[PDB]
Amino acid sequence: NLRVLLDTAIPPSFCDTVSSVLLDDFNMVSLIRTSPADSLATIKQDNAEIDIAITIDEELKISRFNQCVLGYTKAFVVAHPQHPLCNASLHSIASLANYRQISLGSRSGQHSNLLRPVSDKVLFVENFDDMLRLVEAGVGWGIAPHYFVEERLRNGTLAVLSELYEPGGIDTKVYCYYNTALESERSFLRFLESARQRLREL
Amino acid sequence: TNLRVLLDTAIPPSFCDTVSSVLLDDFNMVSLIRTSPADSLATIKQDNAEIDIAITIDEELKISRFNQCVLGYTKAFVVAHPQHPLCNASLHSIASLANYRQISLGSRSGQHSNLLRPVSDKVLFVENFDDMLRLVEAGVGWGIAPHYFVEERLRNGTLAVLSELYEPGGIDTKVYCYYNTALESERSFLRFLESARQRLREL
Ligand SMILES: O=C(CSc1nc2cc([N+](=O)[O-])ccc2[nH]1)Nc1ccc(Oc2ccccc2)cc1
Numbered sequence: 001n002l003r004v005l006l007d008t009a010i011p012p013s014f015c016d017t018v019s020s021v022l023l024d025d026f027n028m029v030s031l032i033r034t035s036p037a038d039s040l041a042t043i044k045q046d047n048a049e050i051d052i053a054i055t056i057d058e059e060l061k062i063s064r065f066n067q068c069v070l071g072y073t074k075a076f077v078v079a080h081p082q083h084p085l086c087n088a089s090l091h092s093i094a095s096l097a098n099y100r101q102i103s104l105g106s107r108s109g110q111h112s113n114l115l116r117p118v119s120d121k122v123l124f125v126e127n128f129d130d131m132l133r134l135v136e137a138g139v140g141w142g143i144a145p146h147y148f149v150e151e152r153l154r155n156g157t158l159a160v161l162s163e164l165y166e167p168g169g170i171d172t173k174v175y176c177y178y179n180t181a182l183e184s185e186r187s188f189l190r191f192l193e194s195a196r197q198r199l200r201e202l
Numbered sequence: 203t204n205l206r207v208l209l210d211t212a213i214p215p216s217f218c219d220t221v222s223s224v225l226l227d228d229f230n231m232v233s234l235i236r237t238s239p240a241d242s243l244a245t246i247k248q249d250n251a252e253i254d255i256a257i258t259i260d261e262e263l264k265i266s267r268f269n270q271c272v273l274g275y276t277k278a279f280v281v282a283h284p285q286h287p288l289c290n291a292s293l294h295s296i297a298s299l300a301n302y303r304q305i306s307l308g309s310r311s312g313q314h315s316n317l318l319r320p321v322s323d324k325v326l327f328v329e330n331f332d333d334m335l336r337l338v339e340a341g342v343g344w345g346i347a348p349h350y351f352v353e354e355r356l357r358n359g360t361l362a363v364l365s366e367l368y369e370p371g372g373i374d375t376k377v378y379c380y381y382n383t384a385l386e387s388e389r390s391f392l393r394f395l396e397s398a399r400q401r402l403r404e405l
């Protein structure tokens with residue numbers, strides 16, 4: 001029945017709040033995980049047959065796909081505590097651009113405005129695990145979800161760099177892209193309503 | 203010390219007045235200038251403009267001697283005349299909106315950022331929000347405008363909201379503070395940031 005793509009920037013709790021609400025309406029449900037850099041390329045494939053996509057990546061007029069804001073989540077710009085960016089005030093994007101960025105690569109090679117690397121010096125990886133291993137080791141800087149960097153910010157294994165830019169983290173819209181068939185279904189609007197209502201309350 | 207500050211017209215009055223309040227507390231001698239969001243960045247990048255700070259919803263990333271940060275958040279609404287085809291039906295995507303005339307803010311430069319560029323291909327450019335809503339009131343198209351510009355007309359039934367299904371409570375929008383490289387070292391500016399941010403969160 002319902003193929004649902006979830007993106008790895010969506011928090012585990014955010015998934016289970018999405019998971020549960022679907023259980024109340026649908027019986028059969030497939031959950032699929034991708035990088036945020038591959039999420040919108042995945043749904044665009046016809047042969048993938050994906051009904052819903054919950055991701056942070058953004059686009060305007062998509063073929064056969066509606067769009068809505070499901071809620072918000074936080075990302076943090078991070079680096080090793082002894083990395084030169086820490087021992088320094090960080091007022092611009094062009095200050096970060098002097099140093100190397102560890103970004104997610106896509107299978108296509110291109111990125112959206114939101115996910116395109118902001119640096120001249122760039123090193124691509126395929127998941128946030130790989131990204132943070134490099135960053136922990138002192139190689140570059142990266143932007144990653146709160147849940148991926150939470151434990152290490154308490155440990156002092158990483159430092160936050162984005163805190164004068166946007167205190168509390170970099171607020172990020174979580175979109176829901178959905179197949180146009182799902183416009184009508186009362187079960188889907190219920191899903192939307194109860195997903196949102198609960199995602200606010202986290 | 204002395205400051206010339208730009209604030210765009212998408213920033214609501216209580217947000218403007220809060221920012222005014224803190225600046226006058228931390229600096230002596232402040233000046234204000236108001237512009238369309240679509241002309242805010244092009245204004246501060248002029249030679250003889252001498253604007254030290256710009257508080258605006260428009261985005262650029264790089265391309266300037268100005269530092270960037272996020273001062274706060276603000277809500278916009280997609281609106282239309284209560285009749286008009288878009289109301290007598292549901293509305294899930296850009297495709298539906300792109301079948302009708304957008305009344306967009308136009309820039310004097312000619313260009314637009316990714317944020318402010320019109321989504322439809324049937325488009326009609328105005329120079330401010332007053333003019334946008336005059337055409338929207340009259341039934342000519344749809345537009346996106348701040349809450350405080352449409353608050354009174356929405357409760358009258360003069361306008362209707364087309365964007366509650368897409369983003370309940372309004373389309374959330376970051377308010378950026380662009381600032382002079384000279385200000386980055388000054389304690390008064392950092393105090394200003396801390397105080398304004400906390401007061402803005404309290405609104
Ligand atoms: O790096 C990028 C492009 S890749 C990207 N990956 C993301 C992951 C997520 N997520 O996991 O939720 C969200 C957004 C992402 N964007 N943008 C970028 C945004 C803000 C910054 O903050 C600054 C800090 C100091 C001074 C100036 C700016 C720096 C860079």
Ligand SMILES: O=C(CSc1nc2cc([N+](=O)[O-])ccc2[nH]1)Nc1ccc(Oc2ccccc2)cc1
Binds near residue numbers: 348375
């Ligand atoms: O039209 C634009 C670009 S121009 C623009 N002017 C702005 C003013 C403000 N402000 O005053 O605060 C803020 C953002 C602006 N962006 N974006 C756009 C955003 C969301 C929409 O919502 C939908 C509604 C129904 C179904 C699908 C989507 C539609 C269009």
